Amino acid sequence: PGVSVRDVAAQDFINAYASFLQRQGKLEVPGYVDIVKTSSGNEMPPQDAEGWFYKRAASVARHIYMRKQVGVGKLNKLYGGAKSRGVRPYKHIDASGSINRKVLQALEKIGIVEISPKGGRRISENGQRDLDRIAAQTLEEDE
Amino acid sequence: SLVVQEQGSFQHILRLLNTNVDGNIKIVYALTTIKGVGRRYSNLVCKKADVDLHKRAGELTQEELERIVQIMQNPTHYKIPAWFLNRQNDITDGKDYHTLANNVESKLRDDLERLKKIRAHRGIRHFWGLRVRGQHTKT
Amino acid sequence: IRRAAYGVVRYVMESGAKGCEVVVSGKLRAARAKAMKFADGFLIHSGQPVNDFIDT
Amino acid sequence: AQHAVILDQEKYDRILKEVPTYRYVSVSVLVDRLKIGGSLARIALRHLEKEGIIKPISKHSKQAIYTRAT
Amino acid sequence: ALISKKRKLVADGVFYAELNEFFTRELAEEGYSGVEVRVTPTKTEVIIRATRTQDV
Amino acid sequence: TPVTLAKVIKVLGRTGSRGGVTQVRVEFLEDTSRTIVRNVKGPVRENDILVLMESEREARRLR
Amino acid sequence: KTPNGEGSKTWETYEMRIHKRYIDLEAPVQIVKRITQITIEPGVDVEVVVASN
Amino acid sequence: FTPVVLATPIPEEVQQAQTEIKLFNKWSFEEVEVKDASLVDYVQVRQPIFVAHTAGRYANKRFRKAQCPIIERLTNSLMMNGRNNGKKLKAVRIIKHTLDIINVLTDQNPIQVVVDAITNTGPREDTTRVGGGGAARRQAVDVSPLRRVNQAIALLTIGAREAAFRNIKTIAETLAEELINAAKGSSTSYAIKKKDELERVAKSNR
Amino acid sequence: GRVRTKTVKRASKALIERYYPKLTLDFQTNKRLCDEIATIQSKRLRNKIAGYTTHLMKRIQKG
Amino acid sequence: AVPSVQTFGKKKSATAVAHVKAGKGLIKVNGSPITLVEPEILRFKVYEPLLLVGLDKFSNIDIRVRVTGGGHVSQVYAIRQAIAKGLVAYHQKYVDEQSKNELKKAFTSYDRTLLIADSRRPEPKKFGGKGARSRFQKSYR
RNA sequence: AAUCCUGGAUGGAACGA
RNA sequence: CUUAAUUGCGAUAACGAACGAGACCUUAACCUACUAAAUAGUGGUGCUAGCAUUUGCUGGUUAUCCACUUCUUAGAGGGACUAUCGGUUUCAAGCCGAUGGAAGUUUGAGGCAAUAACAGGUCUGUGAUGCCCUUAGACGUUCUGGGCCGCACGCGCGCUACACUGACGGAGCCAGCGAGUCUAACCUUGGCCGAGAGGUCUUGGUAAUCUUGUGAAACUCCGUCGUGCUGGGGAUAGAGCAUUGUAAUUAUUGCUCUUCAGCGAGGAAUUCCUAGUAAGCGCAAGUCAUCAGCUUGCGUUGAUUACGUCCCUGCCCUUUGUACACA
């Protein structure tokens, strides 16, 4: 019948693809990992922490598969949240740009995401095939 | 995951750097009990050391604890990025030391008293006990 | 002031207005202020017909 | 800061003996017996559903709902 | 040149207002009622509606 | 635990200091044809059913 | 509404409307200059451009 | 009951219940029914529903409130105290878990358990201050069925809230044990305690 | 409150006074007739007048 | 060409367009299946239009829905409204008005804003308050 | 063809320019 | 008697009028009927990607067209008038309930808004202004630097909060009202560097077309905490890195690490509020080189409780008493 990433629930797909990237062990991890907060408006590093880069990579891979073109500022908008500014009211604050940039560069390196015309990054057909096969295995889990 | 059957070598006051670090909690916050270190620093340290952060503090045998303490007191030797530190650029010598001791209070007092010596406004306000970060002192 | 205002009112209602009004405010014959108010005919104060018809 | 961080010998035995006798089991129940704290309550519940002792009818975090098995 | 339509129209309004005050202060004797502006290609005409067209 | 029901038949008028009490004419199903006047706290439609803890009462207009 | 500060804090929103239309005409240039010298009106700004490609 | 497979794959397992008789995937608004007379107008049951969100206009005229489903009214009463204004989704999930628990304990229709709790917590007598003119007294008066159910819901939710507040027990657990101990006259619940207090105060003031 | 005003009532009274052999009991054709017949400056007034004429026609027919 | 209609549902901002053409069962939303919508609770709210009729009335068609505007709940209500309206539109244009009346009668005996849109809309804000009716807190001395 | 009927209340303290 | 309404029925030494109210205007809600629309969309057809391949599914695509306008924009119009029915009312004005309807509290919210006054505020908005004062070591104008922020205290708006319907970390992604560079340097996409703030090379937009589907937050899916002033309240205070600006020192702001206070639901008193309102949640604009905890608006999630009374505070009318009239 055919499958796509739109046919699978987002949380289960992102978990499966992040575990697949961690088992494949060939994307990259930058080195200043487990030394960053992922947002200036955060207050702790991620709690997974032997990870969370495959999770962020799987999430933006699904996000680029959904959209046409995203750039780094779009992902900073997407992964930013409410900063508790102490005793003043909260505010939306964009996430760390270096994390998303290096995730996009590592996904270009592994060949899921390509650079796009009209700016930004686009999904590649190789990455489209990989994401569809991971979604097929994802809903293959429940048999 | 699965349930372990840990044994009664568990020690729940085991102390480091002149502070009674509590046990029977998670090590990162147990270490934040110490001066000079907080949640972020403790997580970084216990990450640089290969440690099970899903494990309490009365575990963590003493070689592990002392490896942790070595990382704490000499962090830059283990690729800690030196913007992470508190007393960065250190007007006594111009290096990046992390004050994690009662040295934190001693150096606080020394900074205040050198400001008093040079007769800085910040030091005079510290002397009188007022607010000094530029606040209204109407309330 | 009376002559002036009533002459204005006469000339307007001769010109063919449905109504007029002349308010003269200030010091008249004294120090303490007083608003004299002269009028004739018809006048409205509310609605879009103000913005349409009356000229102020 | 009251009680029951780690079992260390015996509350394993107490759990594995007693929990199949309850009608409703969750974190708050295992704790209001002042057995295991909440972290170990979550872990123990995962362990018991793994072994098939308890019948689960939960669906998500922050509220687990387990009963006996037959 | 090359100015947004919002600011263009606001500028037209302020131009109207400034002309209105100017002609109010100048053409007081001459029974100045109002003005109109009509922008065209090649030319921009400014009509002055007043009582007497002898002095103006 | 003796308790008496009562169907409303005529809502009379609102009553009390702040107008939060309503006078009601009630007729109760066990031994009907015995109407009473009572006071009630909350909203009432007629053809509503009450729960009287005591029936040996009759309210006057509160002031 | 007030010049000064005294009073109930009363506010006032004034508003201007701006209506905008556009037309595309496939024309020869003599008709083009005829239709730019036609239809001049007060209170209305007109712009014209050519070779929209 | 025979499935109807389809291009988009529906879950047939629950397609069964879906195109069958209607309910919240578990519990019917069939054989459940209100135990007590006098308050068979102010419980919406029949009509049934699926889930208790029901973005409806009830607090508009006077009694469409009474035509509203009691479960929606419980969610709505849970949605309060500042930090929980909105969060109707939290309330619906709490109600889901609460009815699950009231089925686990006391295998039964938790809808029926809730209805019994309501009708057993509804105070049937209450006091009002008459005017007098400065020194007036409390007078015992009857209580309408609508106020009975409303005060029932308020008391249950408030007891659950003040229990779960600053306690490991979850609000669903507190609401569950309170609805149980109200379905029975256990006299351990905030609701029935307050009911008894008000009723005996009225007895004193008559 | 839905009390009609004197402009409406007077206009309806006049329309009945001098156009009674027209003016069906239906609001719709009465409305279109008001359009045909009177220089009313607003649809809302036209419809209010038509409604009141219809009301008066009804309580004319029944006496 | 192929038989098709298009309808819409609204809830405060969220226009949910629904194309309904002849097909072989397929129901889908913003480009997916209705089995997966959001937030795991109101999936039954979107199923409601599908069940009260009986699921047999979809095997011959292909529903495709697309949404914008609003929030999660608003979009849920919009899509269920859109599905119902698209269904009755199909049963008007290509099936008998009798079956149309039946479907409308079911959906309207339920009527939690399933055919008819919720007329409620936001009262504006007014000065003196954080909101429309609310006013700031005065002091008196 | 049966058939008896009702109108009705009060309720503390509150100085000055 | 009625009405939100000196709004009406009507009574009648008054008659016929005017103002106000209402009418009106703007906005919000309905229109598979009109006019159309690559600066808004849809369908299909080409070309193309992935999965399935048995048709299919999910996408991409500017000079691939062709067709259409349900969705979006508007312009002209329509529509609701308490319509119909039943009760109630001398049986009049009206009121109540149901039905249908997009809509049935003057449909919702506002604008405009009478006569008479306050010795209300404002000469610090005015090249609006009388009188008085000052008018060239000038309270004129301008330059440097400080102050308007200064603290034993009292009061008023408000902001975070005092926790497991909760925090955190990941996976949350759905909005609407807006604004924006010319003789200029605004809103800024994309790529690159940096943990972060932010820096640099280009690009688009004088704007329904670019920022910007402003992919905002609260919220949902998974886990980590687990009742402890605790990991959540985040004040102080130390050190460092940038940005804006001639200039930031009594810190302009932003970022990182550390320090981690009071606060466990607030007596006595008191405010606001009845539906898409209260409340929670953020976003735009205003001021603005920079700085929001403010305001003006916008939307997102969305309850409880009356549908009344004149008891407190007051308002309108009438009668009545008055030794009051700056009352």
Show me where the domains of chain E are located. Answer: 7-56
Number of helical (H) and strand (E) elements in chain H, helices listed first: 7, 2
Check if the beta carbon of residue A94 is closer than 8 Å to that of residue A13.
no
Contacts of F22 (CB under 8 A, 6+ apart): F11, F12, F13, F14, F15, F39, F40, F44
Residue I13 lies in a domain: yes
Experimental structure resolution, Å: 3.1
Q: Before J124, cis peptide (omega within 30)?
A: no
| Rounded Cα distance, E24 and H159, in Å | 75
Element (H, E) at D22: none
Boundaries of domain holding A96 = 1-143
Tokens standing for A131? Answer: 């994401």
Boundaries of domain holding J122 = 1-141
Tokens standing for J2? Answer: 């192929």
**How is the beta sheet containing F35-40 ordered, strand by strand?**
F35-40, F21-27, F4-15, F49-52
| Rounded Cα distance, J28 and J63, in Å | 6
Contacts of B64 (CB under 8 A, 6+ apart): B49, B51
| Rounded Cα distance, H173 and H177, in Å | 6
| Rounded Cα distance, J23 and J3, in Å | 9
- Angstrom CA distances, G21 to A74, E4, G37, G38, I56, stand at 34, 15, 19, 17, 49
J113 touching H, CB under 8 A? yes
| Rounded Cα distance, B89 and B83, in Å | 10
| Rounded Cα distance, B15 and B6, in Å | 21
Look at residue H23 and give its three-state secondary structure. Answer: strand
Tokens standing for J64? Answer: 């495709």
Check if the beta carbon of residue H32 is closer than 8 Å to that of residue H49.
no
Residue with tokens 């097929």: A136
Which subunits have 3 or more CB–CB pairs within 8 Å of chain B? A, D
Beta strands in chain F (DSSP E): 4-15, 21-27, 35-40, 49-52
Which subunits have 3 or more CB–CB pairs within 8 Å of chain G? E, J
In chain J, residues with a C-beta closer than 8 Å to the C-beta of A9 are 36
Q: Which one-letter DSSP state was computed for residue D34?
A: T
Backbone angles phi, psi at G36, to 5 degrees: -85, -30
Backbone angles phi, psi at F25, to 5 degrees: -95, 125
Closest CA to F27 of F1, F3, F47: F47
| Rounded Cα distance, B30 and B39, in Å | 9
Question: How remote is the C-alpha of C12 from its chain's centroid?
Answer: 10
Tokens standing for J26? Answer: 């397929």
Torsion of CA H47, H51, H55, H59, to 10 degrees: 50
Helix, strand, coil share of chain D (percent; to 5): 45, 10, 45
Q: Which fold has domain E7-56?
A: GMP Synthetase; Chain A, domain 3 (3.30.300)
Q: Which of B40, B47, B80 sits opposite A44 (nearest CB)?
A: B40
Check if the beta carbon of residue G36 is closer than 8 Å to that of residue E41.
yes
Contacts of A82 (CB under 8 A, 6+ apart): A41, A90, A91, A92, A93
Hey, what amino acid is at H142?
Answer: D
Hey, what amino acid is at B90?
Answer: D
Instruction: Name the domain count of chain A.
Output: 1
Residue with tokens 């054709």: I29
Question: How remote is the C-alpha of E17 from its chain's centroid?
Answer: 7
Backbone angles phi, psi at A81, to 5 degrees: -145, -160
Task: Tell if the CB–CB gap between A37 and B40 is shorter than 8 Å.
Answer: yes
Interchain contact D/B (3 or more Cβ pairs less than 8 Å) = yes
Tokens standing for D5? Answer: 């961080």
Element (H, E) at A121: strand A121-123
Q: Determine the distance between E38 (CA) and L5 (C1') in angstroms.
A: 47
- Angstrom CA distances, C32 to B47, C1, C23, C29, stand at 85, 16, 16, 9
Q: CB atoms < 10 A from the CB of A132, how many?
A: 17
CB burial class (10 A; 0-12, 13-18, 19+) of residue I61? exposed
| Rounded Cα distance, H147 and F51, in Å | 12
Check if the beta carbon of residue H157 is closer than 8 Å to that of residue H172.
no
> Side-chain half-sphere of F50: how many Cα atoms within 13 Å?
34
Residue I1 lies in a domain: no
Torsion of CA E24, E28, E34, E35, to 10 degrees: -70
Instruction: Name the domain count of chain H.
Output: 1
Nucleotides of K under 7 A from a protein CB: 9-13
Task: Tell if the CB–CB gap between B44 and A45 is shorter than 8 Å.
Answer: yes
Question: Smallest Cα–C1' distance to nucleotide L114: which residue has it?
Answer: C45
CB burial class (10 A; 0-12, 13-18, 19+) of residue H152? buried
First vs last Cα of chain D: how many Å apart? 37
Question: How remote is the C-alpha of H150 from its chain's centroid?
Answer: 9
Contacts of J81 (CB under 8 A, 6+ apart): J9, J10, J11, J16, J113, J114, J115, J117
Task: Tell if the CB–CB gap between H168 and D65 is shorter than 8 Å.
Answer: no
Q: CB atoms < 10 A from the CB of G31, how many?
A: 11
Q: Determine the distance between A32 (CA) and L195 (C1') in angstroms.
A: 7
Closest CA to J118 of F60, H60, I5: H60
Element (H, E) at E8: helix E5-26
Contacts of H191 (CB under 8 A, 6+ apart): H117, H121, H152, H155, H156, H159, H178, H182
Torsion of CA E3, E4, E10, E12, to 10 degrees: 50
Contacts of A67 (CB under 8 A, 6+ apart): none
Using the CA of H87, which nucleotide's C1' is the nearest one? L301
Beta pairing partners, J19:
J6, J64
Residue I15 lies in a domain: yes
Contacts of H180 (CB under 8 A, 6+ apart): H102, H105, H106, H113, H117, H186
Binding-site residue positions of H for Mg(2+): 164, 167, 169
Q: Which of D5, D9, D12 sits opposite B3 (nearest CB)?
A: D12
Check if the beta carbon of residue D39 is closer than 8 Å to that of residue H120.
no
Q: Which residue in chain E has the smallest CA separation from G44?
A: E39
Check if the beta carbon of residue H126 is closer than 8 Å to that of residue F41.
yes
Task: Tell if the CB–CB gap between B44 and A34 is shorter than 8 Å.
Answer: yes
Tokens standing for J14? Answer: 């969220």
In chain G, residues with a C-beta closer than 8 Å to the C-beta of E37 are 42
Task: Tell if the CB–CB gap between D5 and B25 is shorter than 8 Å.
Answer: yes
Sign, CA dihedral B93-B97-B99-B103, equals negative
Structural domain spans, chain F: 1-63
Look at residue J33 and give its three-state secondary structure. Answer: strand
Tokens standing for D63? Answer: 């509220």
| Rounded Cα distance, J13 and J77, in Å | 11
Closest CA to H190 of H126, H121, H143, H105: H121
Using the CA of B122, which nucleotide's C1' is the nearest one? L250
Residue with tokens 């209609």: J5
Hey, what amino acid is at A81?
Answer: G
Q: Which one-letter DSSP state was computed for residue B78?
A: G
Dump the DSSP string for H130-172. Answer: --TTSS--EEEEB--HHHHHHHHHHHHHHHHHHHHTTSSS-HH
Question: How remote is the C-alpha of J10 from its chain's centroid?
Answer: 6
Q: Return the CA Rg of chain C.
A: 13
| Rounded Cα distance, H173 and H163, in Å | 10
B8 touching D, CB under 8 A? yes
Instruction: Name the domain count of chain I.
Output: 1
Q: Which residue in chain J has the smallest CA separation from A12?
A: J36
Check if the beta carbon of residue H118 is closer than 8 Å to that of residue H199.
no
Angle at CA D18, nearest 5°, toward D15 and D22? Answer: 115
Closest CA to A100 of A119, A116, A82, A80: A80
G45 touching E, CB under 8 A? yes
A133 touching J, CB under 8 A? no
Element (H, E) at G21: none
Helix, strand, coil share of chain I (percent; to 5): 70, 0, 30
Closest CA to H50 of J49, B65, C30, J135: J49
Hey, what amino acid is at C18?
Answer: K
Look at residue I25 and give its three-state secondary structure. Answer: coil
Q: Which one-letter DSSP state was computed for residue A95?
A: B
Closest CA to H7 of A2, I39, F11: A2
Q: Which of H7, H19, H54 sits opposite J55 (nearest CB)?
A: H19
Backbone angles phi, psi at A95, to 5 degrees: -80, 180
Task: Tell if the CB–CB gap between D9 and B10 is shorter than 8 Å.
Answer: no
Angle at CA E43, nearest 5°, toward E42 and E49? Answer: 165
Task: Tell if the CB–CB gap between H7 and J50 is shorter than 8 Å.
Answer: no
Boundaries of domain holding I32 = 6-61
| Rounded Cα distance, I62 and I25, in Å | 12
- Angstrom CA distances, J3 to H137, J19, J86, J88, J91, stand at 76, 11, 13, 14, 11
| Rounded Cα distance, B19 and B32, in Å | 11
**H interface residues, J as partner, C-beta within 8 Å:** 4, 6-11, 15, 18-19, 22, 24-25, 50-51, 53-57, 89, 92-93, 96
| Rounded Cα distance, E20 and E42, in Å | 24
Element (H, E) at A132: helix A125-140
Q: CB atoms < 10 A from the CB of B82, how many?
A: 13
Using the CA of F60, which nucleotide's C1' is the nearest one? K8
| Rounded Cα distance, A80 and H42, in Å | 47
Element (H, E) at J66: strand J61-67
Angle at CA H157, nearest 5°, toward H153 and H159? Answer: 120
Q: Are strands J61-67 and J27-28 parallel, antiparallel or unpaired?
A: parallel
Q: Are strands F35-40 and F21-27 parallel, antiparallel or unpaired?
A: antiparallel
First vs last Cα of chain E: how many Å apart? 33
Closest CA to A95 of A56, A69, A50, A64: A56
Q: Which residue in chain H has the smallest CA separation from J33?
A: H8
Hey, what amino acid is at A41?
Answer: G
In chain D, residues with a C-beta closer than 8 Å to the C-beta of B57 are none
G10 touching J, CB under 8 A? yes
Hey, what amino acid is at J107?
Answer: F
Q: CB atoms < 10 A from the CB of J1, how many?
A: 4
| Rounded Cα distance, B39 and D29, in Å | 31
Task: Tell if the CB–CB gap between E9 and G16 is shorter than 8 Å.
Answer: yes
Residue with tokens 């495959």: A54
